[PDB]
């Protein structure tokens, strides 16, 4: 990057004169597709000979189902965790006397199909997205506990709280206060006396509105910085596809569909081939579930980070520099 020494002395000092509000985004994966796999279905299909042979390794099926269900409930717990800090559901008053600031892209819109607000819908649309084909081997997909409606409703509630009561609703009942005054409190928290606010309100309002428009563009534009969520979904779908495709594999046997061998062969001499298929597909399931556990632990870490961000940035002005943004927060 650029280089510039800093003219430093023993009696020189820089001091700012004019300032600029800003806005910057931040993405955080918070969940992933809770799934499940019925072992016997996958390994064996609808045979019984295969079921008999699987009775050798008996504990593996219940083992794997336990693991995957653990992952599922973990996912539901994360999603529950981030979006639950308010015991209320506040409603933004229809009055829009917000000291000049114009929250019209972020507050929800009843006239929309859902209650998703503008930027919310824009985002939701940007990440555009085979299902039933996969489902045709028992690889079902349990659906999330919270549909996006309730999620958006939680978000709107949080907005209502943080613009009506400022922050106190994070520490008990919500106590309303005029928005300009709340902004002044925010300033008085970072070392600038609040009079600067009540003397620059108009300029600051204009800066904020322009900034919001900037994000409206930087998302509605083709510049898609949503690599994170997209790649999460990508790795999930790709692992799924690897698993499924590993059925055409032969693992050194004569065929790759049970009915083939069972038809063209007698039990006491085909059971070896069935055994080979069993071993192979079992190994596949094993590595798959292991990868799944690891990635789920990763997402769990990310979700805890998100929860901390939600509690410390939104519900109150932070002071951990460069933790809830860039520069003074």
């Amino acid at each position: 990057g650029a280089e510039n020494s800093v003219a430093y002395s023993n009696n020189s000092i820089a001091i700012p004169t004019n300032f600029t509000i800003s806005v910057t985004t931040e993405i955080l994966p918070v969940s992933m597709t809770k799934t499940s796999v019925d072992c016997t279905m996958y390994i064996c299909g609808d045979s019984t000979e295969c079921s008999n042979l699987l009775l050798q390794y008996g504990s593996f099926c219940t083992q794997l189902n336990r693991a995957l269900t653990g992952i599922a409930v973990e996912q539901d717990k994360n999603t529950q965790e981030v979006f639950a800090q308010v015991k209320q559901i506040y409603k933004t008053p229809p009055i829009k006397d917000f000291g000049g600031f114009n929250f019209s892209q972020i507050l929800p819109d009843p006239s929309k199909p859902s209650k998703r607000s503008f930027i919310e819908d824009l985002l939701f649309n940007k990440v555009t997205l085979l299902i039933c084909a996969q489902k045709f081997n028992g690889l079902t997909v349990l659906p999330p506990l919270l549909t996006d409606e309730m999620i958006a409703q939680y978000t709107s509630a949080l907005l209502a709280g943080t613009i009506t009561s400022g922050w106190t609703f994070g520490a008990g009942a919500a106590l309303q206060i005029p928005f300009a005054m709340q902004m002044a409190y925010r300033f008085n928290g970072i070392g600038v006396t609040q009079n600067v606010l009540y003397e620059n309100q108009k300029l600051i309002a204009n800066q904020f509105n322009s900034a919001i428009g900037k994000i409206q563009d930087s998302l509605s534009s083709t510049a898609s910085a949503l690599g994170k969520l997209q790649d999460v979904v990508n790795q999930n779908a790709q692992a799924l596809n690897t698993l499924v495709k590993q059925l055409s594999s032969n693992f050194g046997a004569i065929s790759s569909v049970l009915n083939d061998i069972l038809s063209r062969l007698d039990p006491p001499e085909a059971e070896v081939q069935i055994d080979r298929l069993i071993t192979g597909r079992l190994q596949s399931l094993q590595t798959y579930v292991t990868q799944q556990l690891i990635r789920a632990a990763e997402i769990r870490a990310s979700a805890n980070l998100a929860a901390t961000k939600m509690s410390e940035c939104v519900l109150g002005q932070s002071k951990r520099v460069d933790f809830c943004g860039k520069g003074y927060h």
């Binding site: 039933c132 084909a133 045709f136 079902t140 495709k245 055409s248």
Partner: peptide, 28 residues
Amino acid sequence: RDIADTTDAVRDPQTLEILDITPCSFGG
């Protein structure tokens, strides 16, 4: 066939009619 190599449509060896297939292994 399909995205992932499964028999999903067959032509009848008697009437030369074209069908598709969707099984019923319906979840847990």
